[PDB]
A paper describes a structure:
The essential and metabolic enzyme adenylate kinase (AK) undergoes large-scale conformational changes in response to binding of its substrates ATP and AMP. In addition to the well-characterized ATP- and AMP-binding domains (ATPlid and AMPbd, respectively), the enzyme has three functional loop segments including the p-loop, the selectivity loop, and the catalytic loop. Here, based on a comparative structure–function analysis of AK enzymes from E. coli and the archaea Odinarchaeota and from human AK1, we found that conformational changes in the enzymes are to a varying degree linked to bending, fraying, or unfolding/folding events of the termini of α-helices observed in various structural hot spots of the enzymes.
In the closed state, however, the side chain of Lys47 shifts rotamer and forms an electrostatic interaction with the side chain of Glu44 located at the N-terminus of the helix. The crystallographic structure of the AKeco Lys47Ala variant in complex with the inhibitor Ap5A was determined to 1.8 Å resolution. As expected, this AKeco variant adopts a structure nearly identical to the native structure and has the ATPlid and AMPbd subdomains in the closed conformation. Structural comparison of the K47-helix in the Lys47Ala variant and in the native Ap5A-bound structure shows that there are no major changes to the helical structure. The observed local helical distortion caused by the side chain of Gln48 binding to the main chain nitrogen atom of Gly45 is further maintained in the Lys47Ala structure. From a functional perspective, the Lys47Ala variant displays a significant increase in k cat relative to the wild type (1.3-fold increase from 360 to 464 s–1), while K M values for the substrates ATP and AMP remain unchanged. The T m of the Lys47Ala variant in apo and Ap5A-bound states decreased with 3.4 and 3.0 °C, respectively, relative to the determined melting points for wild-type AKeco. These differences are significant, and the roughly equal degree of destabilization of the open and closed states indicates that the open-to-closed equilibrium is not affected in the Lys47Ala variant relative to that in the wild type. However, the local destabilization of the K47-helix resulting from the Lys to Ala replacement does correlate with an increased k cat value as observed for the Lys47Ala variant. On the other hand, the Lys47Ala replacement led to a less stable protein with a more dynamic K47-helix and increased catalytic activity.
Numbering used by the authors: 1 to 214
The structure:
Amino acid sequence: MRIILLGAPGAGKGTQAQFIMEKYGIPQISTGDMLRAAVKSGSELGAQAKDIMDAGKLVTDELVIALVKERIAQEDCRNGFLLDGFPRTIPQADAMKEAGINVDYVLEFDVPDELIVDRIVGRRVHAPSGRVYHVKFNPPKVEGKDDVTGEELTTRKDDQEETVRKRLVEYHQMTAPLIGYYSKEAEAGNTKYAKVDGTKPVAEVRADLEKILG
Ligand SMILES: Nc1ncnc2c1ncn2[C@@H]1O[C@H](COP(=O)(O)OP(=O)(O)OP(=O)(O)OP(=O)(O)OP(=O)(O)OC[C@H]2O[C@@H](n3cnc4c(N)ncnc43)[C@H](O)[C@@H]2O)[C@@H](O)[C@H]1O
Ligand code: NA
């Protein structure tokens, strides 16, 4: 099974990706996690993304296309994979089509703009896994600690209100057009397309997604 998740910043994609990976046994390919890991380790491929991400802007198409082509060439992707944050522009989507990469489901998370800031300013993350929490809406079992490993959670440097506002403007200009792109692909028989109400509680969104995916 191959899946793409679409939606605005803070819509809940990373939260739901963890449940899909577990139930269907496929790896997640998260371009944001890969870029943040490259910055932390100083990797030649991606470490220069630091200043762009902290400004709330998208990194270049060529850099993230190379990161994804390297990741999915690997062996855990022979049974499928889940794309979370890629594609982010029409040229990234066209690059996947031209490479012959087709998917089975495109899942859109619908969330009103007015909810995004307060979701992101309360976000706390376990950087080694990509797992995510919220101090008010979805907290860990022990404050400040990852549920699965118990290790200390951190706050992302780009998760302040003014950066989030810039990311949303960028989303509307560059990324929202992918809803139409994959709606058109689904009408041609090339994938299934479905939308979920991302304002429901975490456990209900999970249940709605399981009904779609079977
Ligand atoms: N392909 C690409 N091309 C170019 N540049 C790229 C790129 N990919 C990455 N980049 C670069 O990386 C930067 C950051 O990108 P990115 O890493 O993708 O971060 P983002 O834009 O800020 O938004 P997310 O996708 O991380 O949010 P989400 O939909 O996953 O929701 P979440 O589960 O976290 O949940 C949000 C919060 O709400 C909480 N929450 C989740 N679900 C619910 C719920 N149902 N009810 C209440 N609260 C909830 C969560 O606990 C959490 O605290 C970009 O600006 C760009 O520079
Ligand atoms: Na397909």
